[PDB]
Amino acid sequence: PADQPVHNYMIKRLDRRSLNAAFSIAVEALGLISGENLHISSAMRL
Amino acid sequence: DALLGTY
């Protein structure tokens, strides 16, 4: 009398991990895209 | 470079 079907209870935990990416731009560079202009002598720059 | 235009 030693069979007595067994029962198991396993447990696992999460593992933390990140994933990054870089990106950059100049400050006046953005400023040019703000204005809506139809020349005004800044096309080649724009 | 930083050419704006020609006069």
Portion 1-40 of A in contact with B at CB < 8 A: none
Residues of B with Cβ-Cβ distance to A40 under 8 angstroms: none
Task: Tell me which method was used to determine the 3D structure.
Answer: cryo-EM
* Among A11, A39, A10, residue whose Cα is nearest residue B5: A39
Are the CB atoms for A20 and A10 separated by under 8 Å?
no
Tokens linked to A4: 């007595």
CB contact under 8 A, A41 and B5: yes
Q: How far apart are CA A34 and CA B7, in angstroms?
A: 28
Q: Which residue has the tokens 């067994």?
A: A6
Q: How far apart are CA A42 and CA A45, in angstroms?
A: 5
Are the CB atoms for A46 and A32 separated by under 8 Å?
yes
